[PDB]
């Protein structure tokens, strides 16, 4: 029951979410394997996984882009399941717990740039990880500003 | 091997540095910041007054500079000097004792301002290699093989002594002459943060009050 055991730690909608990642996280390694079977001094192969580690680090599933061994060993579903939006709202200390962040996404208090986001299971790029905020004029961004005694209703915060 | 803070930029991008002064400077040291502005290339002099060290650091990481040179003084004689690498890089508070400003001497002219060669002498310690790699990156990379001014950083007796020289090469010997400042210089503390931070981790710190303080070198 590894699929359930990580559905709890990150709070997932459907128990099938895990194996929806673990099909991708396996598909990384199958492309890693056949790209390991090409000869090492091939300017395709040298170009092609560094082309891929650019993307898998921008998305942020893997910690570094130097170690080439991470691509088979550290690519786990729990790695890709913590660039989920409610985990990121718990990493950035927005909500208190990780269930409570799903409660705030589903009610509609969080946003990415212009548009608010409503699927809890929004993957967030490490580049896009800068831009999550509380949605403006919300009743939960109004309460935060009352704690510091710094509301400003010309913003109608 | 270069330091881990300077590793990404090392040879690729030129540095851009800022020489700025303490607070309401005396007119002697406000000259003397201009000799620091001339001793490096890519150096601009921004007079400081009613800036805070946060909003002069934080409005410099934003605009993007490699590091920051701030000076201090006692009664016109400049005493201290810090270089602080900006993208969360280290800082090095230097004490500098024997100064001779360039504006004292004669109206001999003006400096060469071309990319200098360097001379680092008597740096053996691993902390001595830190001071190498934190001073060296204040100059624009790759000087020409026949550029004519060379800046020596000499370390006899734990006081890093820096002089500015021009040289020409005669039929037999090199003949040199001095322009620019004479320093003695001494680092006394080395933070891993910038000079803003004031609670960053202290890599090195000149201990004065120790039974073997006068014994060792680079201590």
């Amino acid at each position: 029951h590894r699929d359930t055991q990580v559905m709890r730690t990150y709070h997932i909608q459907n128990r099938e979410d895990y194996h929806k990642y673990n099909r991708i996280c396996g598909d990384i390694r199958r492309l890693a394997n056949k790209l390991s079977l090409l000869p090492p001094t091939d300017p395709f192969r040298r170009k092609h996984e560094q082309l891929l580690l650019d993307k898998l680090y921008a998305m942020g599933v893997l910690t570094t882009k130097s170690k080439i061994s991470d691509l088979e060993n550290k690519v786990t579903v729990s790695a890709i399941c913590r660039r989920r939006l409610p985990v990121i709202m718990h990493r950035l200390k927005m909500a208190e717990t990780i269930q409570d962040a799903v409660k705030f996404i589903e009610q509609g208090h969080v946003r990415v740039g212009p548009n608010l986001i409503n699927d809890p299971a929004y993957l967030v790029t490490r580049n896009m990880e800068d831009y999550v905020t509380w949605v403006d004029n919300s009743k939960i961004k109004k309460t935060l500003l009352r704690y510091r005694n710094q509301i400003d209703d010309f913003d109608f915060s | 091997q270069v330091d881990d803070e300077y590793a990404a930029t090392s040879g690729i991008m030129d540095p851009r540095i800022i020489v700025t002064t303490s607070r309401d400077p005396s007119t002697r040291l406000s000259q003397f910041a201009k000799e620091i502005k001339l001793l490096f290339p890519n150096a601009v002099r921004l007079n400081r007054g009613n800036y805070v060290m946060p909003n002069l650091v934080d409005a410099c990481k934003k605009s993007g500079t490699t590091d920051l040179v701030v000076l201090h003084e006692h009664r016109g004689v400049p005493t201290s000097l810090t270089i602080s690498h900006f993208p969360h890089g280290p800082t090095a508070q230097f004490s500098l004792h024997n100064v001779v400003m360039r504006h004292d001497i004669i109206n001999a002219g003006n400096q060469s301002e071309v990319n200098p060669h360097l001379i680092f002498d008597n740096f053996t310690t691993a902390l001595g290699k830190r001071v190498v790699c934190i001073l060296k990156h204040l100059f624009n990379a790759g000087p020409k093989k026949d550029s004519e001014r060379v800046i020596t950083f000499a370390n006899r007796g734990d006081f890093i002594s820096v002089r500015q020289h021009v040289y020409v090469r005669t039929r037999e010997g090199v003949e040199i002459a001095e322009v620019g400042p004479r320093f003695e210089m001494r680092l006394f503390e080395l933070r891993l943060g910038t000079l803003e931070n004031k609670d960053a981790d202290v890599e090195w710190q000149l201990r004065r009050f120790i039974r073997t303080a006068n014994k060792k070198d680079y201590l």
């Binding site: 990384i28 492309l31 395709f44 929004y122 | -």
Partner: protein
């Protein structure tokens, strides 16, 4: 190149025929599998990252006709090259 101890399935007459008759026939089929898998990865990865619905890029012998023709088409090929370059 490393010699393989395992017996060659191809016979001596067959190996000569290959010599008698892209980069490599095995390596290109490795490259073709691995780009079909990556475009599948970008779709699912792209859908989670994107805030808007995105259609699948791809769904993976006789004459082949390009649906869209690149460049002017009516204009001659010679015209595109500059005079200086000939």
């Amino acid at each position: 190149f490393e010699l393989s101890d395992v017996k060659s399935s191809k016979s001596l007459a067959e190996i000569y025929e290959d010599d008698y008759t892209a980069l490599s026939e095995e390596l290109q089929k490795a490259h073709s599998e691995i780009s079909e898998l990556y475009a599948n990865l970008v779709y699912k990865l792209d859908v989670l990252s994107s805030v808007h619905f995105v259609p699948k890029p791809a769904s993976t012998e006789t004459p082949t006709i390009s649906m869209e023709d690149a460049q002017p088409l009516y204009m001659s090929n010679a015209s595109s090259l500059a005079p200086q370059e000939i």
